[PDB]
Amino acid sequence: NFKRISYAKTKTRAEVRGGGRKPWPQKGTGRARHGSIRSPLWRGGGVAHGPRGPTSYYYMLPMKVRALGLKVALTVKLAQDDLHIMDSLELPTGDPQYLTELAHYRRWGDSVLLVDLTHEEMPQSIVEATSRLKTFNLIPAVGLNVHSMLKHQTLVLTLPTVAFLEDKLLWQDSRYRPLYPFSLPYSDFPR
Amino acid sequence: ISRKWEKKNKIVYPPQLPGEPRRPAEIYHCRRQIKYSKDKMWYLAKLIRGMSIDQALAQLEFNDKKGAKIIKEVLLEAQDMAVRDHNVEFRSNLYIAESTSGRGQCLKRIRYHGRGRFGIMEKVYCHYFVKLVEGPPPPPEPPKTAVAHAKEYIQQLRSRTIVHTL
């Protein structure tokens, strides 16, 4: 929801074409009294309480809360035997059928999320295999998130990725309250 | 719009068995978009229900209403169609099984009133439906006689139980 922007919009009685004049006198005609043909009671009139977009849904959970969520997702996967640790993601070939057959033999479920340490250093073989698949998705460590972890039945992390995530997630537990954004220079950050 | 009445002359029944009674021929005919009122047409359709084809034609030939000529026109072409295309032996051996009028697609026109006021005038159209069945016209129901009432009254006395108990 935080990056949702709804683009639905309707026209109020003030924005519908025309509708300026009073359609007929207040009294004497025997008809119901009306001020504008673009009233919400009229066919073709304005909308009383319709969408008024574009509308933003932005909000931010506390940084510590979002970090804790990543911990829980990793624990749930390990506790339910859906997490597998690899030394590297290098395949013998770039054929996607190999990776598909490997997952079936090892009982990895329908979909698998592959997490590498960095985008630039991803092995070419795994890049070629995953690029041609739909349920086998390769992401860098910085791209890990709860939604992708829950959408995918199996999670595969490389050993460097494991060290990467522990450093980032445990830093939240022992850190001071910020004095200014962490993007700015600190004594012991980054690393 | 619906045009189901014209599709009833296309129903092919399976061959009859040797011992079954000869099935009467049934002919469905109608005229669409007649410039005439269905309310006024109903009286003419009501008149010839149950009549023989020849009696209905005679009654309509001497009626002064405009619908009479149109219905007579429909009855004649239906009679010809029955013998020509529906294997009816005798053209006179036909009777009006069903005859009714329906509402057609009508047009709206303005009718002018005084003082700058108006009304909306409807140019009325109607349909006419007729069903011809082979055979003599069914006899009318005899008026319920005194013996029938007395028998019915005693029947209700005899079906009378002791209510709200064992």
């Binding site: 005609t29 | 697609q105 047009l107 303005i110 108006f118 909306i120």
Partner: peptide, 20 residues
């Protein structure tokens, strides 16, 4: 008592001109 007159309103012509 001030004279009170309500002039008649003509509806759109097209609503009474449609043909088959």
């Amino acid at each position: 008592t001030k004279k009170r007159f309500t002039p008649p309103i003509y509806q759109p012509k097209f609503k009474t001109e449609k043909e088959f």
